[model samples]
Structure formats: structure tokens, C-alpha cells
Target chain A: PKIQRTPKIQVYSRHPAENGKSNFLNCYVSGFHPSDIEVDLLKNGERIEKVEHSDLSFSKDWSFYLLYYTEFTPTEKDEYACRVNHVTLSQPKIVKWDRD
Target chain B: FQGPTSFHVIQTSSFTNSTWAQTQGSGWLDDLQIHGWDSDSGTAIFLKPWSKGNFSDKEVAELEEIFRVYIFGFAREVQDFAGDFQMKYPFEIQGIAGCELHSGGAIVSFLRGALGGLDFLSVKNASCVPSPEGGSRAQKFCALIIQYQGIMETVRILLYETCPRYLLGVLNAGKADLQRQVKPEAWLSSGPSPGPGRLQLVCHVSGFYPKPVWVMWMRGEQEQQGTQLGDILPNANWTWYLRATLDVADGEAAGLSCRVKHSSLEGQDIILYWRGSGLND
Candidate 1:
């Protein structure tokens, strides 16, 4: 690609956060290219393994987009986040989750 | 919060260029990808991820039915219209129709068409207008299109009425799904140097909900110049990201830091210091 765009990380859940209930958590990263990127879902700063990943793809702008998700339960004391690794970044990017 | 749009392209090729695209949520959602338009079969070749959008089965069914019947008529209608003009074999006819829902419940809608990526015709507020950007040839084509018996009214109902009606249903039904609140996380990284003897310190803030965010490069007590901002790009999960870079030439970046302001952070802002060390942590 002629242009480079930094990845935008969006961490959200498939359903409204209800304490004690399990839901699908999604970490969607978009607008990055060369399509060589890694995504992971985190619960309380600990790694969640083997999260399901969608096939990598690009958009009209040619920037890559991806979807990484896992099943997790929301609780009053715990927090969730997503971490991304790509060549364009100086380091692996970690993004916290939000219910918005 | 959104403007759903559908676009069409008729050409002698694929691969490099697709035939159709249907998008919702201000064109953010990859709702559906229709492969080609040689005929009804071409118009029907569909592709979409299982969870690409928030469309209900009922909604998707109704939408497919709408496009199935309407696009056929639109394609042939333009077919006859092009027969009267000097047209090329591999040229394209592009069409886009969408509606926007504003905050106060006011809705605005529009439907426009183009030739070879240039604007040719536009139906706005139920009035037929021509795109001068497409040149005199297209201007003449749109001029006659506006006068077509009952054509303008049909588009007015389709775009201004029916389109928004569907959007309202989609939006209301997904109202809870569209609702979101996101917190931003800030980090520090080295950017491309400004010149042979400079350092570009970047503060990247991302994954914030609602799109509005504030980020700054500072030197403890004072804000620093040398700071530059990048576009706030959207995320598929309804969040946003921003890149702020500071170029230091004569001075040093050891004392500089990055600060982020977002609603989720509450009253406190995220301040990250840049260490000259080679590590991202």
C-alpha cells in the first residue's frame, strides 16, 4: 500500500454488560495494512488463549481490518482489554475495554 | 448518528473494481458485497460476514427484497437512457442513495447518480438536480431525467420516505446495540524523526468510546509546540483513535510526556512519560 494508517482498536461486548452473565467480547482493529497484525482479548490483565479470529481482509482504502473475540463473564471487580502487535508500532499496543 | 448508503457500479471488469456495495452506520458497516451486475444474477451474487452488521433476519430479508426488485428496474431504466447518448462499452454508471438521522430526530435524505465516478444526477429534497462536474453531456442527460414523467416523485418516495423509514426501524431496533461507552488508553512510541537531528515523540491514544478525545504532548507543567495531530479514525467496534506527534530539534524530549482526556477516564487524565530507552514499555 502507498499509504500507512495506524490501527484503531475497538473493544466491546456482544451484549450489554450484566454482572455474572457470560457474553462474547470483541476486539476489532481496523485501518492498518500489510495485514500482518496480531490481536488478543484480556481479562483482568491476564491473557485469554486461542480467541476466535476472523479471516483477515482489506477495505476500499486497502487498510486491513480484523475481528478477535472470546467468551467471558463480566463481574464487578474485573476489567477487560485488548492487545495488538504489528510492525508499524514501536511496541505492542494495549487497549482497555469500555461498555459504550 | 448514522447515514446508511448503497452504491452501484456498472463496468466491464471485476477483481480491481466490484459491482456493488451496501453499507450502514455512516458507511462503517460492511453490510453486504454484491459481486456484479451483468443482469439479475449478477445483482444477486452476495457476500457478507455472518456478524458484519446488526441487521436482524427480518430486516435483511426486507432489504434484499427491496434491492432485488428495484435495482432491476433502475438498471434497465438507465440502459434506455444511455442508448440516446454516445456511450462507451466499458464505461460506468454509479449510483448512491442514503439517508441521515440527526440528533433531534430530524432526518435528511438524498439519492444521486454519477457517470465514470463523476456526479451526473442528484435527487435532493425531492427536487431533481444535475451535477455540472460531469460536464455538459451529463448535464444534458440529467436535464431530461428531471423531466421524465413521475420519475422525480418516485425517487422522492424511495429515498426521502422509504429509505428513512427502514433506517428508523434499523436504528430503533438496534438502539441498545448501538449504545456504547468506551475508555481510552494512551501509550508512547517513537515516530519518524523530523530531520537528521531530531526526535519525533508520538503519543497514541486509542479504543476510546464516543469519538471525542483530547491528547497533548507536554513538558510537565507546560504544553509543548512541535505537537501535531492525526485524523481520529473509527474502529469497527464503535471506538476511536488519535495519534499526536511532537518533533524536538534544538531541545530534548526527556522531559516531555503525553496526556489524554476522555470521558471514561473521569476527572483524571492519562499521562505517559517518554523514556529514551529502546523499549516500548
Candidate 2:
């Protein structure tokens, strides 16, 4: 197997409007090689506990790339980030929330 | 007598803003361009974009009637071997005729609607190609393709003769409206991780119309490399969106920004700064 590309990661809020309504932040990581990956969620630099995640899913066309998503309701005045570790990267990749 | 010869008819329409303008009846016989003259408007709709010609309301109606007659006749000559053909909200109608001489001794034909289904036919001595499962539908389809072979020349002549008139009718009956330009909203954000030590930046622009916009990364005064540009894709509301990214080395993070150029901006380009704290800071 060949490791061709690095992971493309994006972090966004599912719904940016409607304050005080229940909304989840989504961490989307795609276009990476090798299925074995370690992902972590953090809130304001602290590791989050009890995170919910989707099963490692492959691209619809079976392109050897995969996607993983993690979702959580955001807390007030807190910054959230997704940390990713894949074989293609020399170190872990961290994506932070910038929408707010 | 020889190998297979192909026939095709294509009609195209373009929408910019709310205005819908269709192309003049421009089609091909195999690889040959067909020529025609529209005398009602005293200009060739196939000739020039600025050619002063408009299709009257009555002409538009008659043109559609003629299209229906021809397209339906073409459809009856063939059965759809392949499933229905469909197009995204954007394009046109076309018909294809094929004749295989040596191998199958058959003929095949099909018609495709701009936003609708397909119909096909095959003629004698030329059997319809069987589908993977060899089902009844596939057999019927193959038969149609074979049956249409005998009349291939007739269909070709009809298309050649009528296409120019229909093309003229469409061009004369339709109004060409000015394209509306909508301004796009642009912003700067972060790109995927460059592992633990590196950084990437992204610029996203969306909700604009009349396409033709440029997005680039600017580092102070100079434009840098290591940029990845995304395709301009349509939005749900018929607008368009695009994205571009710039990979930043540890020393080049400062003074970076996203620049956008579009006709809607009236010569002034929009620039967005990356206000978030630096990764290595």
C-alpha cells in the first residue's frame, strides 16, 4: 500500500445560528491513507471525556481514503479542537474552531 | 455497406440570472457541422451572438411543436436499452443514430431530452446487445436498436433538413437577457494540520453568481506558492462557491491574507486577514 496524501481536516458548527438551541460541533477529517488513525477532542486545551464518534467510513467510490467525524454540543466561552494522528503525518494534526 | 456511422442532434440552453437563452440549432452529422439560414429575423442565429434577431412568441410555440414531432418520431424508432438519461438543472436535448454494417448488420438509435429520459431502438439483422442479466427489458432494447438501422439514412436526412429551421426558430423566438452579477461573501480560515509543527490556511467564497471569480493567498506584498485551489461548484440557490488554501511554513505565518477578485466588486478586490493566533506563537 502507498501513502499518497495527507489528511484534510475541517471543524465546523452544525448550526451557527439560534443561540441557546441544541447544536453540535462537527470535526470532519477526510482524504487520508491507511485506516489506522487516532483522534481526540479537546475543549479549551483540556482533553474532552465521553466523546461520540462515527465509525471509520471509506469514501463512497472506494478510493483508499477514509473519513471520521466526531460530534459534541459546545459549552459557553470554550474553544474546541480535534486532534488527529495518522501514518502520513510526522506529528499529530490539530484543528481548532474558528467560526465563532 | 461499411462500418457503423453515427448521427447526433444537440440543443443547448444557457441560463444567466433569470434569463434563458438557447443556442441556435447547431448540430453535427458525425463530425460535420450543419449550416442553416434564418430569414424571419434576416440574420443567422447560428452566426453571431450580437446578430439582431428574436424569436416571436408564435415562432417559439411552433418551434416547440416541431421539436416534439421530430423527437417523438425519433423516439418511436428506438427503445431505450439503457435506462433514462437525466441532466442536472443545466443543459440540453440530443439524439443519436448508429448503424453497424458488418458485424451485427443492425441499426440503433436513441433520443435524449435535456432534462428528461432516453428512448432507443435497434433494427433487423442487428440484435440489441444483451444486458448483463439478459432480461426482457434488455432484449426489447436490443431489438429496437436493430430495427432502427434500416431507417438510419431517413432519420439523418430529416434531422439535417429540419435542424436549421428549428435552430432559426429557437434563436428568433427567444430573448437574450443580460446576466445578473451577484457579489460573493469571502472569509479566511484554517486548513488541515501539517502535522504537529506546520500550519495551513484556507479562504472560502460562496453565494455569488455569474461565476468568473478569482481567489488567492497574499503574504504582505508578495504572492506565495504551496496553494491548493478548489473547483467552483454550484450552490443550492444557484449561486457558486470556491475555496483555496495556502500552506504556511513556521516562519511565514505572519502577514498572510486572502484576496478575492470579482466583477461584482467594481474593480476593488476583497481581502480578509487571518486574525486567529498563530500555531507556533
Candidate 3:
């Protein structure tokens, strides 16, 4: 079995989306064993949707995606997060826009 | 978006003493200025000296309001040094003995250095002369030679370093305009048995460039170790702020306080304590 690790999540563009423009949300996961990975977008506490990525393999290690037409605003009112999963890693990594 | 500006000196006086009348300039209040007795009028017209940054009038006004509010708020929460203690500017609280005022204008010099480029010192001679009205000797003799140097230092540190983290806490907590409410009851509520309830702490972000700020609710030191609940953007004109909520269990026995951490407003770390009839008020 792979070693247990806490995958780190980073928010590159806080004010990414503008009116009538495309926005992006990137999640980079590290300290994971060479195994299958899964990423999900969460709103509140429930999973909004699963992300599909072409460069999503055990060898690649990290993933980035452009959240097009996202309705997220640059305000201090919303709470969002991205959860990461590694097949070889025992525990899943969860990173929120704000902490729980 | 705007960068820093130059500095300015604040001078206010209506002379009744020759020494003050001689040194008082049209707008500048030099540190070397002096005030003494005028045998004729017997009234002292001190050339009050103060300095402020060359911020916009609106920003200055906002800063003034913050200064006003914080002075009162701190007094309520902690000991009112301005009222309870008697000391001079550049005066250190050495042990328990009376504070020694730095003569030869050393106090002002030290203040100028401590304030870090942005000058905000004000000197006004205050005496503990007793009045005819009855009062305790200690109360009558307690006076503060307002150097205001330390206060300005507090403000500067808060604005530059602490305000950003505080703004993040406010934004991350949950609500905007949270700090405006004077009483905790306006924002915080509690359950009857104290099993589990929401704790809403209103944290206000006030300063020259009031940006959207962050606030957090912490039961202990570890509460702030990791977590991002909310965050606000920058707003120059309006007072940006937010609220923080916490889940309280009946058995959870620890102090509940809201921390408004910000880089802009450093030093002034505000903690909203949870004191209701349900627990301990």
C-alpha cells in the first residue's frame, strides 16, 4: 500500500471570473503515491460535480481545470472546496475556499 | 489601488500666552514649541501639536472615526490607561513607580522614531492640579501628558500588517458589515441549554482603505491553525467587515472568541467573547 499523505490545494485566481468572461479553478495535489486520482467540486457540503481531466494519471501527479461560465462571485459570502482522492493513499484530501 | 502619499502636520491654537503666540506658525506646530504662564490673562492657550498622513479627506475622516471608536472600545474591554493611569509621552510603564517624563524633548524624538516616518504625535501640557470640587486625591492628580505616539504606532502597525489578515477573517466568517453593530446581541445568539448553537461575532474593518475583511470564530488557539471560511475584496470608500459563526457543544468548555485577523489593521486583534445566560455572562 502507498503511504498516507495530505494532498495540498491551492486557489490561484481568487477573482478569476468576470462578467461574461471565462474563469478558472485549479487544484494541485502532491505527496501522493503513483496511483489513480479523483477530484470533485463541492458546494456547501454536497458534491456539485466530478471533474474530467485528460492529464489525470498516476504518473502526472497534478491536475488543473478551467471552470467555464462559473457563477462564483468575488465576495466574502461563499464557501467552496475541492476534494482529492488517491487509490493508493488511504485518506482523501479536502481543501475548501474557507476552512470548516 | 492607490499608493501612499506624503505627510502633514496638524496645528490648532488660539493664543493667550506670548511663548505660544511667538512659536505657533500659521499651520505648522513645531516640536520645539513651548507654552508658559502669561501674568496678565492667567489663562494658558497651548499650541496643541498633532500630525496626520496626507490621506484623502474621506480617508482621514474614516481614520479619525476609527481612532475615536477604538479608544472607547478598548477602554470598555480593558483598563483605560488614558483615564486610570498618569504618564507622559515616550513614557514607559517602568515597574510600579511614577513614570518619568523624558525631558529635553526626547519624548517627541522617540515618538517620531517609533511612529516610523508617518508622524502622529501631539503634545499638550496636562497637570494634576486639584479643583475646588471634592474628589479623591488620586483621581484629581491623575493626568496624561498626551504624546499619542504609541497610539499612532498602534494604528500604523494595524493598517500595514494586521488589516489584511483581519479582512480575510471577516470575509471568511460569513457576513459583511458585521462590525457596525455595537452590541454582541445584535449579531450573536445562544441556545437555552448551550448544547449547540451559532455564534455570530461582528467584526468591523475601519481604516483609511477599508477593504473587505475576514473574521473567524475560535474556541482555542488551534481553531485558526487551518481553515478558510470566507474572504472579502478591497473597498476603499466603505467600511468592509464580516461575521464568524461557531458550533458550540454543551461539554465544550473553553473561551469562545471571534478573531478578526488582517494585515492592514495589525496589533488591534479584536476578540468577541461569548457570554450569554446560557453559559457564563
Candidate 4:
């Protein structure tokens, strides 16, 4: 049987200062197990397609886990959310970001 | 903090002309022993030990799985070439292996040959560095080290978290033995160069184990602050040593002393008093 561990999910935005530069929203999920993880990005309660992201990475000890992020540019008044699904969770973990 | 909890894996290989070695740390966890042909008539042995003795069959199998599924697999991905290169020049591996687990996270360091000696390959989290290149084959191995972060992390978990209960006992016993087997030999001496009216008090602490030893200069009953303390370093024998220095005025050398605290002392501290003449005298 596979061990079940619920991953910790966090969402944040990186605002670069250079003019005409795109701001990035990062969805960081870490400290979970058994690989098989799915992450989706949503804008204002709608799924965003064509998202670029990185594959999940195991922690140094490999007992737990973490993953790379999907980056997206945001506009004013846009609500960004990251939805995560894993074998350990009954319901998908969702995190949202608001303008700073 | 009681101490930094850690583990290690040391791999050693003996060949015709030279010995290849590697170490993984911050704790001692498992061991594996394998035999292969050095030539048609002689045999070469690869020994991986946490401290002493060989790993059990299950442990050896698991390690083989790690090497096959991670190390070799990544090497193939990097170079698109494959073969059983275990006993070859670039693959001749040996050294200390260990890891440290903390509240923030865990770190696993596998050093090849000697500690800080030569970097065959190294991995930290998701990044790796293959140093002191050998050739095209060794460069390929270096690339394997750079990309095998995930697999290394998994192996670290196995060795650090869920390897075996008895292995933990072995590690603990080895730690205790290390603490008991070595005692710090301390001496007080004048610093190489002395000022006109100032004397330099140097406290040397050597031949201690469990690696965490505290050395300080004390004046009578008060602990002297702002003294120069050097880092704890390992000796060739695997024991640890350190030094601390304090400059005292020619008149202030009366009550100077060097104090050391270590697990071997068992709540008692080693104190060495200075009775030598001052620099001006």
C-alpha cells in the first residue's frame, strides 16, 4: 500500500520592476508523497489552458515531496488560483492570490 | 539543540594502482559489500559502511536498486550510453555517506574519497556538481550527478527515515563509541608572533569525537568574550580538532585558562591552566 501524505500548497506573485515586464504567479506545492500529483491553474474561477509548469520533484530525503511552478502574467482585478489533487487528499487543495 | 542529528554513507574501492573513495553525510546509516573481478585471477572489493560491519542482504539489495534506478539510470539519460561500469575508473567509488535532518529540512552529503578531498559528484536538493573531471566518461558521470537530484533525495529518505531500526541502533552505538574512544588533548601555548606588551594565549583542542567540542578562554571565573575561535576540523584518523586564541595583556596572564566541553566529558568540562611566562617576561 502506498503511504498517503497531504501536500502543503502555497500561491504567490512575483512583481518585477522593469517596465513592460510580465508579473509572474507561482504555485508552490511541497511536502507530500507517492508522486501522482495533478495541478491546475485558474483565473477568476475559470481554468486557464496552455499553462507552462515544471514537473514534481522529490525532497532530499525522498520520503516527502515538492514541485516546480507554473508562471502566468496577471492583470488588475484578476483572481489567480492553484488547484492541486493527490492520492492523499479527499478533496483537491486550492490556493488563491489577490493583488498586493 | 541537543546536537545536529545526522547520518553518513562511506564507499571505498581498492584497485590495482590506486584506491577510489567517497563519503555521504551527515549521519551513518547503512553498509554494503560487493566482490568483482579486478583481473582474471584477482578480485576487487567494494565496501560501503556506516561505521563497521556490512549491510544486511535487504539493505544491499535496496542500495543496488538505488544505484541502478537512480545513478546509472541518470547517467544513461545524460549520455545515452549504458553498460555495467561499476568497477571502472569513473565508477570506482568510495567514501563517507551521511545526512542531517532538522526542523527546516534535511541535507544529504555523499563525499567521494576524503572529506573535502575531491568532488567526484555531489547533489544538494535539486542541483548537483561533478568536480575534478576524469575524462569523457567522468564528465558523463558528472552530468549524471547534476541531474539525479530527485533520485538522490529518495535514497536519502530511505537511508535517513526508513532504512532499518537496527541500523539506527548501530549508528547510535557508533556515535557513543566515538565519544568514548577519543579524548581531547589540549595545550596552552604562546601565539607565534607576540606584541610588545601583549601576550597571545592559544588553546589547542585535538583528538575528540562526536565532532562538537567547545573550546574557550576563561579568565579566572569569568568567560572571556571576543576571542578568536577556529572551526572544528576532522583529522585523518576521523577524529575532530579545533583551536581558540585570546590575546591577553602581559599583566593579565595570571588567571588565563583554556576550557573545553564535549560529550566525552559527561557534564564535566576539561580545563587547562596556563603557567608559562608572559611574552614580555
Candidate 5:
């Protein structure tokens, strides 16, 4: 049976955000089904190359998860965002990296 | 067509009561999950596409019947073993038993058992090696199971003969997926602070399949010995991912570059250089 589930994206850093500190930017996309989805970690509104992707996995209920992350130092000037494209949405879903 | 690929299936059952318990099984081929067992239905659930394993309708029925009957007998054996060993309920009996098909008509087989997720028992030749982590209780359990005549001999036939044949069937049936080539996506980033004058360059590789992969940190025609390869894990879609880290002092030549070599990429390796000392640009 084919079903569509919207992806939930979480964007964050591996460690506490500090300018000039080398850290991993993690974009976790989860809860999507059919396992066909695109997740990208973008820097300054451009697709960042050489990012790492996590193995696909599923929850007990059968929805899927994929994590795309890259290493970077977060500075105030840099704009990092995660973009997702799936059948559930007509357009790509974009979520920016935000810290509290 | 492909060479020897190690495949294994592990079964773990947690006893909730005397009559029934939940038992789950997962099968992997070269670290890619290909099979599963549904505890609710006592049936085999093929995970990957085309991994129904080409079982005929009769065989499919027989397959689930095998587990149904095996668990019925298995439940009895567990209760008796626990009773004899004075063990409690809500415990786990996990078994890792599989075979690897090799050349020279050789097949490597292993069957190990764990109690409560701890290494407890293993089968070697026709005898049990007793508890790896178990004390008297585990030894006594092994001691009890081995008393049956030719017990390990029968197990050996299954492990060596039946397992490899079953594996080859799975391999041949799911070749499209099992022998797939997924080009990896690579990227580079700096690592957490590693003190003065040092830089930790991280190379990330994702979304590749078939699992034969290589990643390293290089310095113009040379492989850096400082490149540390981390464990490769799977994506939900069964693709693989990895991270290779290179630790070097900052300001060493033009510094290092991350390289990825995957069969899917033909022969061209992915090379990503560490651009600047993080955010210093």
C-alpha cells in the first residue's frame, strides 16, 4: 500500500553553537514514507557539497528517517538551511538552522 | 555473479510468560537488512524489494510453518532450560547463526547464543563452548542441550549446508538490489577544536549501496595516515553512509583533501579540499 507522510525536519549542530568552532551541522529528516525523499544541507542559500548522509531507517510504525549533515563553523554571517523534497509536498520544504 | 558476501540472520526472543513471548528476527546480507520475521503473525517479512527471496507459494507457507513449529518447540525448551537453570522470566534468548559461502568449496559457519543480551553460549564443532559471560547457569544450559545425540551434527548440517544454499538463493533472487550501485555524496567540514595549530577535517559520505567503499584524507598524491575511518551505517532506504576524519596541524602545506572511492563512481574518486581554517574566511 502506498501512503504519503510528511517529513519532519530538525536542523541543528552537533555541539553547542559557537562562532569559529568546528562543528557538524545536522539535518534530520524523519517520518516520511515510501523512503523517497531528498534532504540537503545548504550554506548561504547554496547547496553545500561533500555533506554526509545517514543510512535510511524506519520507525516501528514504518515511517522513514534520513539525516544529512556537514561539518562547518557557524558564524553570524553564514546562513545554513536544510531543504527537503518529497511527494507529500508540492514544493521543496526549507528549514533554516536556528539556535535558542 | 558477485563474490563471497557475508550474510547473517539473528533471532532474539524475550519471554513474557510460559506460553507466549515476542520473537523477532532480522536478516542481513553484507550488512544490508534483507529479511525480518513478524512476531505478531509468526511469518517471514522480507524487508528489501524483491527479497521475497523467490520462495514459491508452498515454500512461503512452509517457511512460516517452520517458524511456527520452531517457536512452539523453542518455547518449551526455553521454559525447561530456565526451570532447570533456575532462571527468571522476561529474559532474552538471542541467537546469531549463519554461514558465509567461500571459495575452494569452503563454507564458514557460526552459531552463538546470548542470554539477556550478554555473551553466554556458542557452538563449536559438535560441542558447546559453554558461557562466554555466563557462569554455572549457562554451562548447565549448554550441558543440557548437548546431551542429545548428534545434536551439534544436525546443527552443523543446517549451518553449513542449508544456510549457504538459502543464502545463494536470496543472493540470486535479489541481485538487482543486492548488486546495486549507488553513487555516494561527499562533503567536507572542520571538526571540534583540537587545540593549538591543529585542524580536524571531517569527510562525510552518504547514500551509497553495496557497501564496498573507501574514504581517506590525502595530501596531493599521498594518502594521509591521519585519516580515521568511522563505522559505516545504513540509511532507512538501506543505503550506506560513513565519515572519515583527518587530524592534521593547521597550516601544513595547502593542507588536506577528503577523497571517496566507491564502485558506483566507476573509477573517479571524489576529492573535496578543506577550503579554509573554519570561518576564518
Candidate 6:
């Protein structure tokens, strides 16, 4: 049996906006086979969208992009979080965007 | 006349003159969550404290943003106000799986329309924008999120008034046109051949009230003659139920149904179909 290792998900950085416009977020993943990469967008603790690429080489490096339009007039102030999944490499990574 | 008991002068930079913050009957000042989006010109800030009667005409005039703030006493009032302002508010969050389960699916349609009607209350305002995340579907999801707090209040009312109990009934309404397809076997049970055993069919009229119980068994477009399992008793706001048994010849080929008819608040005929039977043997 092969010892399984988990990939590390890293949301290197993000841009925060206060003018209420669509936000484009770029996320990164490393510490795993590059080919075993899957990234997703999670809002309010639920998966809303996903980004994936299958033909990339396994150099233990991957990145994904997420675009969430500020289409919701938030009823109250709340935080939004996003997550990334590395299927065979490691655990998922989560990142949150906060008002600046 | 009693003079002013106590008062303090509070200086706000926005106001040209010092405003008196009075300590009197129900005049206590309360803090509000200052929304920071339109904070550039302090117009939103002046608009926010309109309830306190603190802004001067000149101060209010200098504000750039054209917006209105509606303050409600309670959370429900806020929700209702949000709904009225053309903003999303929790409404229909729960429903039954079977469409025919509620008045030939008419109840489902009616409820959907009612939930959609909540969107009509949403109107665009400078302070709030109704986004795709802020429509009827979002309201439904919002209801689900607050399901524990207050969503249960509205959900129970809808569920109670319709499909108060789960019916082990067949899938009634669908594009498959199964409403006309008769299934009589549902009315029977398979067991060892016992001499003169009773074949019983039971139905529950949940949330039943006695007014004039009229139960009948129908076939196709024609009513089965003399198959009327007439009125039930104890009719004082309880679900009136009925059971009918018939010894059938091994292969009976007729469709059967049970329908209840009563008068509505408008004094019109209100007929409720509980269950139907297809070809049974």
C-alpha cells in the first residue's frame, strides 16, 4: 500500500473591495502532485462554483481563479469564505474575504 | 408646567449648532449600525439618525446621497420592511414532494405564486440593491438558514393548512398524466386465501372539520351508483376520516376514488379529493 500524502492548499493573497463590485480571486495550491488539483468557490459554507484543469502536468504546483459577482445586497454584515480541494494529494484549503 | 428635567448639549461636527440631547420620556438615544458604503459625504450618516431628530435642515441638505432609512421595532418588522422595500425576505422554504398531495397541485401553484409575490414588494433604493442573490429563491434559502429561529413559524402555518399529514398515496400529478391511470391494487392486500376475509381501504382527512361529510367512490367521469360512504360525525374541528370494505371477486376492473365536498367561506362548493384507486382485482 502506498502512503498517501495530503496536498497543501494556499490562497496566497486576495483583493478586498468596498465599492460593491464583482471580485476576481486567484488561489494557489502546492505540496502535492500538480495533476491532483481541484479548486472550488464556497460562499456561506456551501459550494457555489468550481474551477478545474485535467491536462496539466504534476509538478506539485497549481492555481485557480474564482469570480464572485457582488450580486447580493447583504441583509446584514457577514463574512464570505472560499475553499480548494486537492483530491489525491491533501486536505482542502479555505480562505475568507473581509471588508477593509 | 414642569420645566426640562435634565438635558445635555452634544456637539456633532456635521451640525452647525449644538443639539440638546434630552433625558426625558422615551427620549433615550440608541446606537445604530452605521452603514459605511455611502460614507463619503456624511449624507448617509445624517439620514441614519433621522429617528433621533438630530439633523438640521442645512446639515440634511448638505448630504449627497438620496436615501431613506426605515426603522422597525423588531426583527420581524425589519424583515417585513425589507420585503416591502423590494428586498429579499424569508418566505417559502419548505414543501411536500408530491405535487398532487395538495389540491391536485393547485396548492403548490398557489404557494409558489404567494412566495413569488414577496418579490413584488422589492423595490430598488439607493441604500439597497436587489441582486440575483436577493430574489424569491434567495428568500427561500434565507428561510432555510433561519429555520430554527423564526422560519419555523411561517413554515408550520403553511404545512398545517395543507397536507397536515403524510399520505402513503401514489405520485399524483406529473407530466406522465398518471392522474387518469388507475391503480386498483393499491386498495388491496395480498395474503393467504381466508374464507370471507374483509378488504379494507382507509383514508385520513387531516385537519378535518365536520360540516357536511360527503364521501363518494367514482369511476372515470361517472359516479359509481350507490357507493356513497356518507357523512362522518364528531364534526367540531377535527379531521373526519372514513373506511370502506368490500369483498371483491379476484379481478375487479373499475377505478375508485374518495372525494369530500364542503362549503367554503364564500359559501361556494369546495371539493377536496383525498385519494383515488385504479383498476383493482
Model 6 Cα lDDT, one tens digit per residue, B65-120: 22112111122343544444453322221111111233343332111111221221
lDDT winner, 4 or 5: 5
> What does the TM-score come to for chain B in model 2?
0.49
lDDT of 3 by residue, A6-93 (tens): 4444432222233444333434454443223576665575776544322211111112111211234334455566777765446766
Ranking of models by lDDT: 5, 1, 4, 2, 3, 6
lDDT string for model 2 (B145-208, tens) is 4465454454444444433444344333322322456788886666566566677777878766
Off by over 4 Å in 5: A1-100, B1-4, B16-20, B52-55, B146-157, B277-281
Candidate 6 TM-score, C-alpha based: 0.19
In candidate 3, which residue ranges exceed 4 Å CA deviation?
A: A1-36, A43-82, A89-100, B1-262, B276-281
> Considering summed lDDT, which 10 consecutive residues are worst modelled in model 2 chain B?
B113-122
Per residue, candidate 6 scores C-alpha lDDT tens digits across A1-100 of: 0222355443311222334545333333444421234566555777655433211111201121122222322223545555666545356667764332
Q: Who is ahead in TM-score, 1 or 4?
A: 1
Cα error of candidate 5 at position B48, Å: 3.9
Question: Distance from true position, residue B10, model 3, in Å?
Answer: 52
Candidate number achieving the greatest TM-score relative to the actual structure: 5
Q: Interface Cα RMSD for candidate 5?
A: 13.1
Candidate 5 chain B weakest ten by summed lDDT: B272-281
In model 2, what is the error at residue B162, expressed in angstroms?
Answer: 9.0
lDDT of 1 by residue, A1-100 (tens): 1234578887766655678998778787988744557787888988998688654444543355777888889998898999998767889899998653
Displacement of residue B101 (Cα, Å) in model 3 is 41
Q: What is the lDDT of candidate 3?
A: 0.34
lDDT of 2 by residue, A11-43 (tens): 655444234566555556666544446777777
lDDT of each: 0.62, 0.50, 0.34, 0.52, 0.72, 0.30
lDDT tens digits, residues B1-281, model 3?
A: 11111111221111222222211111111111112222243322333221221234465356445544543443332233423433222211100000111334122111111010111221223222322221342233233322444654554454433333333332233222222222111133342334354333322222322333456666666564332344332122222223344545544524666666554545565666666555633
For all predictions, the C-alpha RMSD in Å is: 10.8, 16.9, 24.1, 23.3, 11.0, 26.9
* Residue-level lDDT tens digits of model 5 in A1-100: 2235799887766555679899778787877754557888889989999898744444434456667878889897899999999878899999999743
Report lDDT (Cα) of residue B66, candidate 2: 54
Model 1 alpha-carbon miss at residue A83, Å: 24
Candidates 4 and 6 compared by lDDT, better number: 4
Instruction: State every prediction's TM-score relative to the real structure.
Output: 0.58, 0.41, 0.22, 0.43, 0.68, 0.19
Residue A4 of model 6, lDDT score: 26
